[model samples]
Target: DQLNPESADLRALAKHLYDSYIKSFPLTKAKARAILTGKTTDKSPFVIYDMNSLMMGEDKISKEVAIRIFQGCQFRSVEAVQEITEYAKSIPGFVNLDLNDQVTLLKYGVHEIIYTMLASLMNKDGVLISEGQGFMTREFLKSLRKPFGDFMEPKFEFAVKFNALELDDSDLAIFIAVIILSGDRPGLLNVKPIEDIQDNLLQALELQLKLNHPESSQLFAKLLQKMTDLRQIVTEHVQLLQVIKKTETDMSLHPLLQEIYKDL
Candidate 1:
């Protein structure tokens, strides 16, 4: 029912992900640029705040942290996004694909990977941010104004369920690779080989699921169905992001996130 970890290409693929994985609070270009550039503000007091603590303990979020937290996630995301692009290239045969198809895959797949990796920072209640410096309750996240609040409701459901899988980093790694090199990505010019790489990745994904998660036949099915949920989730995310752009016109969102949202 399970496969050998030794002498398995799946093991190697998963190992590459484990080695290159991003698991901490990451440094963002936006923050570094702001700190070092001609635009640098006089060092402001920016502390990461726990939304639950701020909301539940009767502690108020300074307008600074309130502004910073969203930016923090956005800022943190740029580096996080870059890392996924790097991982995708490591997938066997991925770089040999038509170049246009490569960008297309990264464009669509990064958000889903973000959501998958977000699993590490989350709980049934909410997620931790800034290297576990703070926490946000699902209730707290959903209480934010308009689409900001609205956006979180979907991620929380999936994240809560994903944590149920109890996946280790290697399982997390292959899943992300599988997410990035997906077959149906739009405008895939070298469609046949892309599918070839994708199929092999799935083979890798399945066997590892068996090896890594014993009694995992149902787990693999559950994981398979979960990938489908992301297509819906990313669709809804774009819908809200469209709303956010129009409504929150002045949001100083990081440019990297802007690119992620732009063509989508």
Candidate 2:
């Protein structure tokens, strides 16, 4: 592949981008394994309480728990977004776009990136690890009142199907870069330039996937399809977030997330 000369830069860029994400988001498998078992302490910033807390009332423990969980998710999201900003800026042409275009892409595209990385924490069985301390079963998430649970179920469903694709860290890195560079996002002033960047990333991704997962037929097509799936999941999640903001006055979404929601 290197002898192709034209693709050597693409190959090098993919490997560097992939390795950077791995280093930045180092949620190791061993750490995840320990959490799945009974071995870890409470690594989550959210406070999980027993059912008896409902009786206490004044603390509004249930409300607090829900807000805490929401905030924790937002925290992870903001951290990822910050890293993504740095990553995109590191790319040669990406930072040269209009500031508004850059903001629009990050605002609209972060959910897809967040969910793609979150997919790593899931398996075929539909268990999701939102925090390092424990897991949320699909049944439990669905059991939450109305849209609270609604926000999560679609994501889990999509994650399960995506996990079936069995993409590794390298695949996710390339996919995420594609998602971020997408020119189809609303409000893009100059779409063609962004689209050009996305096309190059896709080409690099196709060649990389071909070399890395040769045994997996139609892998590139399947990965593209999963991006559509992710968009649907994120769309549903945004609707759910909208409902929460309207109906639940006590619980608040992070301001950064609120801005993203508004821009989206």
Candidate 3:
């Protein structure tokens, strides 16, 4: 059964997420603003390119330009994740957790959250980048070879399915907020409070889904299932990250992402 939006718990949580939490992540909102403003352009470092030319190693982008793009994209991505950390700190209940617990949440939670933000850029085909001017195709992504391709493929796999769910802005907002509040990560000093927050968010999300998609009886359940799929994808992505860290000496990972992977 769907949740009742009139419930006090649901109302309070919904207000908090709608008024505060959703506004906390400005970068995600900026993307939406751009879409609404009709300034669709490729602002990201990941550029649109000819797959044939890229595959033949005939792409004109120099190594410096490529690295600049990589660095720029990595910095923005990590900054987006870090902003999530900042948002968690803004939560009154969340800040009360043990300091180490906070770190554990941020460290463990960021990767999953990355996909949550990526969802905003997604369509049925793949994730959008370069301000929607470039599409990061699944086929070209898989061609990046192991480790690198491993990093992207599962994200696209999940993203395509996630896009199929046909979430609008509000649904996407609540889903990402739920992702941040989840208590399932390991080695927590306390799980109760985090779980409480997550449950509240879940209730709000369930109610919102019912309100938004009354025609689709099964969408809420499908979203829950997608969360499960996200976990599996994260597991694979982390494993691949570790493999790349050890064996892919030629490639340089951003320091922030590198630190995030250190414990894993």
TM-scores, one per candidate: 0.79, 0.82, 0.77
What TM-score quantifies how close candidate 2 is to the native fold? 0.82
Tell how far residue 84 is off in model 1, in angstroms: 0.9
Task: Estimate the Cα RMSD of every predicted model relative to the unseen true structure.
Answer: 8.3, 4.4, 4.7
- Which candidate leads the pack in lDDT? 2
Error of 3 at 230 (Å): 1.2
> Which regions of candidate 2 deviate over 4 angstroms?
28-64, 124-131
Ten residues in a row with the worst lDDT in model 1?
27-36
- Per-residue lDDT tens digits for candidate 1, residues 47-112, read 323554565433422454344446666776787787777777777888888888988889889999
Instruction: Give the best candidate by TM-score.
Output: 2
What ranking emerges by lDDT with the best candidate at the front? 2, 1, 3
* RMSD, candidate 2, Å: 4.4
Instruction: Assess the local accuracy of residue 211 in candidate 3 as a C-alpha lDDT between 0 and 100.
Output: 78
Consecutive 10-residue window with the lowest summed lDDT within model 3: 53-62
- On residues 49-122, what C-alpha lDDT tens digit does candidate 2 reach at each position? 33333233224323554555566667878887787777667555778999999999889888888787676765
